[PDB]
Design a protein around this nucleic acid. Sequence first.
RNA 1: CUGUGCG
Lengths: 1409, 49
Amino acid sequence: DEYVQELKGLIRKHRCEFGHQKSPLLTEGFKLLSSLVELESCEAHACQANTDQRFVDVILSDNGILCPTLPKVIPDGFKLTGKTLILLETFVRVNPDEFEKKWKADMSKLLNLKHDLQKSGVTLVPIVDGRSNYNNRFVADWVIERIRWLLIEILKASEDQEYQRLIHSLSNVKLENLEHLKRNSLDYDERLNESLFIGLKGDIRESTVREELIKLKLWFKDEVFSKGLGKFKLTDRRELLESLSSLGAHLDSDVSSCPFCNNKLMEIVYNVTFSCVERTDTHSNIEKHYLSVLSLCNKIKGLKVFNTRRNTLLFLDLIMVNLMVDISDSCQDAIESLRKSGLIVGQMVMLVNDRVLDILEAVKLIRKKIGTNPNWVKNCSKILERSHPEIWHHLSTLIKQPDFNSLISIAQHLVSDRPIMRYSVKICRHKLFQEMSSFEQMRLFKTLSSISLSLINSMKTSFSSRLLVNEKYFGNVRLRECYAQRFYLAESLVGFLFYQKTGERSRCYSVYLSDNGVMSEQGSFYCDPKRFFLPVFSDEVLAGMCEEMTSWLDFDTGLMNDTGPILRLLVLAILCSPSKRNQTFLQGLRYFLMAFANQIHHIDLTSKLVVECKSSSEVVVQRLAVGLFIRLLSGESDASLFFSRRFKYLLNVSYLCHLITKETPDRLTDQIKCFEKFIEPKVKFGCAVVNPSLNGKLTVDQEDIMINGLKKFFSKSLRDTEDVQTPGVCKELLNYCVSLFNRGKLKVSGELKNNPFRSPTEFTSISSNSGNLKFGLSYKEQVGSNRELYVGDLNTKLMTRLVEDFSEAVGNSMKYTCLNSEKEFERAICDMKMAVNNGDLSCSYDHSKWGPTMSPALFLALLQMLELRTPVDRSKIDLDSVKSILKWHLHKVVEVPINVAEAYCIGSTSLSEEFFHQTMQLNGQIPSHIMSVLDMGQGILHNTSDLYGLITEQFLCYALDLLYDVIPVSYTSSDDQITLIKTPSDAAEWLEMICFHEFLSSKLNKFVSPKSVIGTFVAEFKSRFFVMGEETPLLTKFVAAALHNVKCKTPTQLSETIDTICDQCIANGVSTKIVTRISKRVNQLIRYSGYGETPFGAIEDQDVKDWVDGSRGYRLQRKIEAIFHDDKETSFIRNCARKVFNDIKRGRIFEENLINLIGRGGDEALTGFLQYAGCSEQEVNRVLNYRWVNLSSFGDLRLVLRVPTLIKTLQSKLSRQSSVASGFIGFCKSMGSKCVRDGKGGFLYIKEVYSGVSACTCEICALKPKIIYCNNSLNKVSQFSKPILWDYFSLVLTNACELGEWVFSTVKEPQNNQNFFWAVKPKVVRQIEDGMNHVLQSIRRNYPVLFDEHLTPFMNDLQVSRLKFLDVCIALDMMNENLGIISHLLKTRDNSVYIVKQSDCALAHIRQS
Amino acid sequence: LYGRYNCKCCWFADTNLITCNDHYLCLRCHQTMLRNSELCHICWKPLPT
RNA sequence: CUGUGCG
Ligand SMILES: [Mn+2]
Ligand SMILES: [Zn+2]
Ligand SMILES: [Zn+2]
Ligand SMILES: [Zn+2]
Ligand SMILES: [Zn+2]
């Protein structure tokens, strides 16, 4: 006993439970440490010391609260305040996995006892303190570590696993190559291995595999192929078109042949358009006054300057009514002339909170609260005066009785019918959209844009209360207290969108018009507002897309004249009916076209293109799409003139599905569908053990069902064709594959390089005594169908990370796998392009139910006999750890969603619902956990599944080369693959080879999807379609991506992301006329959000040279130059920038002084650079005169949605559900509140900032109105006034740093069938010497404090820290919040090639220096 | 080398083609593109005689 | 956490 006595003097170095405590000595010290940390954890939350630690029910029995026979729970710290108890159970877990596990197991165990406390007694306040460390408040956190260390040093010198379990928690911290836990058996692992590795030999010779594959081909040719049982067939394009017309073009349906009749929103758009086009399309002073006072009242609405919400709404209604009666006088006819022409409807007046209220009902409600509550106006105006003395512009509104006589006179003057709001769902007078002028169709699109913006703003309405009694959804409602969104259309008529609900849910809107006060009903429809954000301002983007697609068919003048209006009508119907069914149908049409262009396609192809309409709104879209496909494909001889253009057009028409957003119209329905897709393969297979143990101890029946599922998985013979659809794998075929892989016969060899090898006390084949690898099921929003998603606990996420890194390293050691290797993907793209150009047999294969059918047991059986030799040792590294983690994955537990369980418990026929009901009480209890053999999680074993797929596909290529004497080369991506087959010495002789490959793939777990195609005309891989001599650009896909995913947090970031999207779309040859319209749409979005127009943002009026050989900085430079026409000042600034560049490069004397000169700001830095280059104070004052209001001057805009930025990007680079419509609503909501910071911490409105401007109109405030201002025009607001020419100087200097000196020369203008597409390379000439650990040294040298704080708090490579331009072109990046050059320098081009039309390059600007 | 012995304008032709400048071209497609202009609209070069 | 912004 040498260290046992030292603890007596060691523990003395350390308020109630301490003196009582100061081989049972081990447990004594353990309890002392636990009580110490527990008292520390509770002294922060005011617990009570448990000197007895009696129970949870005894503390209620002592005080008096009745005990309803609670289960015995030991409470650490209780705080009972009269009739409310706060239970705090604390724990000390250092490792994050055990931390989260104990946290959840504590929360559940306290909620299970809070349920019975709420059933009788109090509802406890649950608190749990998850201290990840041992830091107390009694000592300096340095003695407790010594106590734990000495306790470890006294335990290590002295049940099954205690002497290591107790010290595994007192250590510092816890990858693979760790099999030293127990490696014990549980009397079930041997039965698992007997059914998982019994038929695997892996040492089969090569000649025997050759002869067996020969015999198998001979059997298949006469038993499955000659019998017609093949899964692939020739095209027979006539039959394909007939089946398309039969599945899509509904002929037995009684719906009309008119999209406007069948779609209610299309009918409303048509009504609004053709009632605004044929009719019409101090007069605007009183409307402006009403709108200003309405905005003011909407400001004091959400400020909580009153007690209740109803009183606030009544007070604002009183203000608006007083404004109405004030405007009624002092004017000859104000209401009958400008309210009828502006914002007023039949008997109703527009109020705050987007509400419209009947005037008579308004005065009826105002008579109350003033009649039953006198002296209310005085005390409700005095509380507003002393709360916001800036909105006191109300002087004659918030006054006494608002002339009730004049009010009822006004009401009886405008007595019109009320909005009906048709709630209940014929002649066809619709002008036959095909026979419309090109202006009425654009008017239809503009009307759709206005109504969609009103729909988006309807989701903006905050939750208010109804002031009237509900006299609501039966057949009709005379609206009196509905919300209304107002969209302006023409000089006199304005549209109203009435709705009675708020939030983000689907409503029943009613669209009305007001021509001159005669409120005519345009219709009523039902929709989800957050699915109508794409057309919110893209009335010209989609028109330009349709024009480009129609111009693609210019080879047949008469084909484009027919497919033009049809395409515009299809886009209009898609937009007015955003449904997942239309997305699915258009994807099916993509696959149909892919099969039509090629020669061999799956027999079950057309069975997958069918999508149940369930509404005429889907029938019209399907009819339009099928009619377009038939018009472009049907015909006898002169119908395939320019088939590349036809294929491109039809592929873009099919990718029009991306116009419809992917936001799960119903979240619970999509969760139910995800659970259905997740559990149907298991129930159909026969292994769906429910709630097995959640710990890792399966019962006898559960072990039996798992072993039966495993046996069924490997019970597929090689000479049976009635099992080519059930999940599983032939053991003998897998043995052949592994044996050919081991003896270097496949193109992927086992000779890998860079070995991938780089509380859980005891582990087994099911778990590791730290859970059971619990995942949780959810969905991922995709275009066609919602993909599966598994969110895992911390320990299971670490295990997936381990196996994924192992498999990713092995795949990097492989050759033909391209999932996380972009070099191999580009090699695959080049080989596929060469194959399509040479006429090779490209087989674009997709695999159906890859995730839901793959099993970690299959990866186990694969890895059991894989060699995987070392590069230098040749020792056959054992895969014991990887196989153990894959066994853990085989016994994983997927928690079903709680919402799905609730929806199935409160419940037509459904297989998953039937299984749920059969498991409710027939066998056990409610299902909450699902374990199974098959269904490897999508995104869980992605790299392992890719490794298996690559090995098996290389075996299949070996089999094809053996049997059919062809040259196959395959590239896989773990979901879909492409096999280029160079045939020796149509495509009817290779149908047998395709069917045999499909049969062999299905004998493994690689069921070829019916969406797979085989042919010699077009190939597809990773949604990249390659055609003979070109590549399909997919214009509609990228345009829809640019119109969608508008993640608008800050306008600068929004503009940046839109610019990158437009760059990647111009790379894939979209246009320069559609990209300028996308930029106009984004600038209009920013302008609508109240942010106003800024000299930066999206780039309008651009050429291909602004995207090719040009970055975002060059686009902003060109935008500033477009602001400054007849460039005399921008040319001078460019000359000064060239002078500075020469002095820093040619003269090479400038360093660390420009950094001192830039940190001042914009005015002083520009002044210093001008004195260093020009040195003419008159010219500097002439240059600094051009200003622009920068709202993000003293920082970033304050925003609550649903320091420089370079440091943030570097922190993100070192370390490793909401809809887009809701995001835009949050953006417009944050950019209208107090977001502009003034440096003193007081955020103010953007309107307050832009009201500080004055009408300068001195030929400097007129070259770009509301963008560029004078210096004296911003004297009232001078803090938000920065020189635009300084930003131009900085942009030009960084563009010189990045992409050459050609950015200084003046732009000279140049002195083509719209289809001459070709690839151009970026012509940049980097003067930066072309990574990491170079910018960090740059910041460290110049900025010591900014490198110390806000940067490098969690780094471990400080031992590493002179580029030509990393001192000034980094200060220009850090001081400019919208320049961002370093993020472009520490990144690749991501395009490296730009497909552009020669008609654009011939119109590009020339800027050669 | 030229194309894969297809029309390069319809792809549905591999018998009795003629080269434009770098690819092949069927007879009816050549006569259709030549009777309306002199360029190719595939390779964007003048069609042969 | 709170917006009145398509002319
Ligand atoms: Mn594919
Ligand atoms: Zn009609
Ligand atoms: Zn001016
Ligand atoms: Zn040609
Ligand atoms: Zn032809």
